[PDB]
Structure 1
Amino acid sequence: SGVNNTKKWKMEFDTRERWENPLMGWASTADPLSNLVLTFSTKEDAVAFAEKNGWSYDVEERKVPKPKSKSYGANFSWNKRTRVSTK
């Protein structure tokens, strides 16, 4: 339930091939950027960084949970379906 890892903007790159090492079976890679992950305060900062480095990019708008209406009293509604059968 913690939301502290959703505060900042991230920039990662497209995933490329990983293959089994013939000797041990370890995951090999030839992608130098496979682990690169940058952090940004805003999406403008991330876009600015991508633009000056020549990377083409996709920006996905931040998804924020929409505010909910909570009411403990509704658990015992006289005539509504919100009444709970168990606690």
Structure 2
Amino acid sequence: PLMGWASTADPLSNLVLTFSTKEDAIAFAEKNGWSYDVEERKVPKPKSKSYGANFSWNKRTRVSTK
């Protein structure tokens, strides 16, 4: 109410716990006490790509500007 700053009543807002696995994450969460929600790890699916696929006589990939 003097500066428009974001004063918070939160100790636990700026924490970030850095882990390497998921089982140890579950182990630490069961060890210290609280509950949690889990996202997966969504790796990029590799797709076949080629410049010789960018050009073709009878396929419809046509850059037409390079």
Q: TM-score, normalised by structure 1?
A: 0.71
Please state which structure has a larger fraction of its residues in strand.
1
Task: Give, in whole Å, the separation in 1 of the partners of 2:44 and 2:51.
Answer: 20
Unmatched segments (≥5 aa) in structure 1: 1-21
Task: Give, in whole Å, the separation in 2 of the partners of 1:85 and 1:61.
Answer: 40
Deviations 1:31-59 (A, max 9, x none): 11100010001011111111111110111
Q: Calculate percent identity across the aligned residue pairs.
A: 98
Cα RMSD for the two superposed structures:
0.9
Q: Secondary structure at the match of 1:80?
A: coil
Task: Give, in whole Å, the separation in 1 of the partners of 2:17 and 2:58.
Answer: 53
Superposed structure 1 runs of 4+ greater than 6 Å apart: none
Residue 55 of structure 2 corresponds to 76
Q: Choose 1 or 2 for highest CA Rg.
A: 2
Q: TM-score, normalised by structure 2?
A: 0.91
Q: Whose relative contact order is higher, 1 or 2, with alpha carbons under 8 Å and at least 6 apart? A: 1
